Design a protein around this ligand. Structure first.
Ligand SMILES: [Mg+2]
Lengths: 129, 52, 51, 175, 112, 187
RNA sequence: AGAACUGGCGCUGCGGGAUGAACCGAACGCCGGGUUAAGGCGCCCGAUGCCGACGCUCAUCAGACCCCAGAAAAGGUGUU
RNA sequence: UAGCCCUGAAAAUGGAUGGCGCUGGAGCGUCGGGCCCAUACCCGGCCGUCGCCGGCGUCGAGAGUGGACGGGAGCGGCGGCCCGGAGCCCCGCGGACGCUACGCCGCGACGAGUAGGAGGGCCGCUGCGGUGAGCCUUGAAGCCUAGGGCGCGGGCCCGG
């Protein structure tokens, strides 16, 4: 751990298994993106046992632990120096990401501004030479 | 009839000074009373047999 | 909600008489226990004094 | 009634309420065999309503105690009178048992009516139970234990399996 | 009486019920009456300002039984840990649905 | 399940206005401080009236106000209306009463200010009487609209008096059968 | 095939009825511990591997659990 | 007379107390002590909805469910020679967090759902006005990926 973020609790999650669409195994035209089944007879909507679960608000995560990374921070993706400085009074709570378009020259500079301000960047060594 | 003999009994408690409680109540459970089996002893009855 | 009847001193937060009710039924059931063990020995004491 | 467990004899007395017409009704008495006192004062209003014009609303019970046999150690011979119902009609019945207590002899009836006659315990009405002395028994199964210097052995004893090792190297003698 | 079991409770039946599973309502909330202030602040109008005074009106059915009862939330008891018998026929008939007149104290101690 | 019946869980009143007026939203913030904090019931009436719609805020004319302030006792109180004060042409001379309202119209506040009265907004009402002491809060005829005379039983029921939707008043527009005993019937 | 009264299914999963639309329990946010209902506890199959109580019954077509999935009159010195 | 059994009692693929089997019972009748487990019930966690509300006092000087002064008379108390009197803080110049008020906080109860109806979407696609002193040949869009995550989800972000 390069940096330590205030109090990090035991992150419990209710499920770690990524809800899939019904019949998404059987076809490849059907993406695994969740669509709730609204057929009149099917056994997922009617909620039989031993079948594909369907998401509801009971699976929601704890409010004090929501959007927590496994490192204990919460990401905030930035593009340059001028919006890295807005995270100065949040550096023990939030962490910065560099957006995927930022060129390897400018990405080199906004991580050296991050080290002076002691803000955690999740991807410091990306697009190096 | 009750309204009539209720209002006159209401002002009877003003002159006499009481708490007569003119509101009516349902049947309470029976009071803890006392029976008397004076002299004799209770009658043994037993179920009669079946004859058609 | 800590449980009355399961700890003291929540009973006593809700009922101050409950303590003085309680050592009375510790004091008197100990004096009925000192009585009966002394009495049951005193029966077989003289019965053993006989033999 | 379920006849749940061993029964328990109750003496139940009770009387219909004093009307303005009738003061001090005579306070009848029955002899209810029931597993507890709540069933026992429930069968009183079953049997009294078939015999007198009384019911639980216009009556009350004025005693319900367990009445128990005086001699729990002495072996007694009981003869009881039955009024069970069958699948076709209903029959009167005399029937003899042999137990150390009255409620144990009528318990031995309800089991025995269900065994032999398949008669469920709500359909059978006990009329009267009393001890009889010997040489007035008529049943030769009860009569055959009236024998001074009686003796018999216990042949072919079988019990306690799985209690010991289920797997043993030992064929268990039945004596 | 097909749907209920009831009977006449003795003194430690209500004493165990009011303390252990007893809850009160003030306006719409089911609160734990863990203080004698909470009984007095609402129902103190009737002079039943403490816990063991509340337990007295509700056993010896007194003048203000109604407002002392309706202060209480319905007692959300647990499942009876001895098991029941048949749940559908009468207690006389062998089951347990109906009046049983003192055996409800034996049932509360499994429920409560 | 419990059987505690449904539809008792939800109430269907308003907890903020649906307006995006940034001057009504600060009047809301002023009064929902005063509602939950000063313990006077005037500030609860005025607060839920700021939430109300435009139909639930009918205009109050100039001679409903001064007819409702010729009454005995109203000689020095202030008139609150949550909504506009228009002016009547019917009234000839205006007393010197003190009013307090959202959005008094142009010709009305020329006649209130010639009379010597004082018009107030709800800011300087709140500084004046925070409890709402000595105010006569008025309302307009909220069932005075042209829409409410179309509502009722039915226009073709017995004694309906409901005024049906015709596209143009005149002869031969909904007047033939059902409206006279010669042609058909009369309801 | 058609009515009445209440519930249900349709819209509704779960435990039990081997299987099941409606029967019996029972209604559902996502979990941990506790306990039970209806049902059960030889082995599939969680729990009688209790030194369970009392009787009844032998079938060369035994019998075995609401709805519920097979039977009657008549007869039997077969036993009780 | 009525319990169990038997006779009465015959159908087409091979077959059904569910099966295997079961006869001091794994059968029938009447019962007892245990024991087994539903998403039900009880206690606890967490999400959400609904209901009743809370804080504009950031008031480390704010303090108030009764409040001042200044006079007519009395004490108990604080400094006696029985005469007696407002001190505005200061040796420390100090004292967390907060409140997008459309935000935050707290308590309590509840959560099935086809057709249908509403709400929220910092879910998504294309185009416009504004706006990021945005991003980019030191590599955009797209496409690929046993790479790393977040979101209950629609989805999104990051590495290669
Ligand atoms: Mg269907």
């Amino acid at each position: 751990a390069a940096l330590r973020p205030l109090v990090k609790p035991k992150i419990v999650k209710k499920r770690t298994k990524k809800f899939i669409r019904h019949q998404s195994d059987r076809y490849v035209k059907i993406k695994r993106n969740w669509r709730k089944p609204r057929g009149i007879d099917n056994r997922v909507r009617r909620r039989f046992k031993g079948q594909i679960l369907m998401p509801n608000i009971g699976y929601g995560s704890n409010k004090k632990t929501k959007h927590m990374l496994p490192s204990g921070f919460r990401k905030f993706l930035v593009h340059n120096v001028k919006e890295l400085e807005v995270l100065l009074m949040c550096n023990k709570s939030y962490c910065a990401e560099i957006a995927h378009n930022v060129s390897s020259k400018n990405r080199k500079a906004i991580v050296e501004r991050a080290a002076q301000l002691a803000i955690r960047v999740t991807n410091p060594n990306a697009r190096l030479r | 009839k009750r309204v009539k003999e209720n209002d006159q009994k209401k002002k009877e408690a003003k002159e006499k000074g009481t708490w007569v409680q003119l509101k009516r109540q349902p049947a309470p459970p029976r009071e803890a009373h006392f029976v008397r089996t004076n002299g004799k002893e209770p009658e043994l009855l037993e179920p009669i047999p079946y004859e058609f | 909600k800590k449980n009355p009847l399961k700890n003291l001193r929540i009973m006593l937060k809700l009922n101050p008489y409950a303590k003085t009710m309680r050592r009375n039924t510790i004091l008197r059931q100990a004096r009925n226990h000192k009585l009966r063990v002394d009495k049951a020995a005193a029966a077989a004491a003289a019965l053993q004094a006989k033999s | 009634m379920k006849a749940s467990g061993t029964l328990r004899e109750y003496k139940v007395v009770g009387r219909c309420l004093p009307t303005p017409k009738c003061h001090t009704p005579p306070l009848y008495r029955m002899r209810i065999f029931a597993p507890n006192h709540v069933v026992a004062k429930s069968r009183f209003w079953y049997f009294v309503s078939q015999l007198k014009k009384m019911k639980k609303s216009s009556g009350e019970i004025v005693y319900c105690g367990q009445v128990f046999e005086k001699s729990p150690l002495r072996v007694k011979n009981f003869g009881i009178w039955l009024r069970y119902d069958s699948r076709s009609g209903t029959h009167n019945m005399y029937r003899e048992y042999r137990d150390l207590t009255t409620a144990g002899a009528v318990t031995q009836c309800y089991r025995d009516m269900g065994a032999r006659h398949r008669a469920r315990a709500h359909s059978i009405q006990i009329m009267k139970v009393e001890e009889i002395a010997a040489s007035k028994c008529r049943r030769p199964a009860v009569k055959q234990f009236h024998d001074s210097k009686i003796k018999f052995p216990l042949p072919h004893r079988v019990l306690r399996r799985q209690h010991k090792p289920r797997f043993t190297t030992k064929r268990p003698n039945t004596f | 009486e097909p749907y209920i079991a009831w009977g006449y409770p003795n003194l430690k039946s209500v004493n165990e019920l009011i303390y252990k599973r007893g809850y009160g309502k003030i306006n719409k909330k089911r609160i734990a009456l863990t203080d004698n202030a909470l009984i007095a602040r609402s129902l103190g109008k009737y002079g039943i300002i403490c816990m063991e005074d509340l337990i007295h009106e509700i056993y010896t059915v007194g003048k203000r039984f109604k407002e002392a009862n309706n202060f209480l939330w319905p007692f959300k008891l647990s499942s009876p840990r001895g098991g029941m018998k048949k749940k559908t026929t009468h207690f006389v008939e062998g089951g347990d649905a109906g009046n049983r007149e003192d055996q409800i104290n034996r049932l509360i101690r499994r429920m409560n | 399940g419990v059987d505690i019946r449904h539809n008792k869980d939800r109430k269907v009143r308003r907890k903020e206005p649906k307006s995006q007026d940034i001057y009504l939203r600060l009047l809301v913030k002023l009064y929902r401080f005063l509602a939950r904090r000063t313990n006077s019931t005037f500030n609860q009436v005025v607060l839920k009236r700021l939430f109300m719609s435009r139909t639930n805020r009918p205009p109050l004319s100039l001679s409903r106000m001064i007819r409702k302030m010729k009454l005995p006792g109203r000689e020095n109180k202030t008139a609150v209306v949550v909504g506009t004060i228009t002016d009547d042409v019917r009234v000839q001379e205006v007393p010197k009463l003190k009013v307090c309202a959202l959005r008094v119209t142009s010709r009305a506040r020329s006649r209130i200010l010639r009379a010597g009265g004082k018009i107030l907004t709800f800011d300087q009402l709140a500084l004046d009487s925070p409890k709402g002491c000595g105010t006569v809060l008025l309302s307009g005829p909220r069932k005075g609209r042209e829409v409410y005379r179309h509502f009722g039983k039915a226009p073709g029921t017995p004694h309906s008096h409901t005024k049906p939707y015709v596209r143009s008043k005149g002869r031969k527009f909904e007047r033939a059968r059902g409206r006279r005993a010669s042609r058909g019937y009369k309801n």
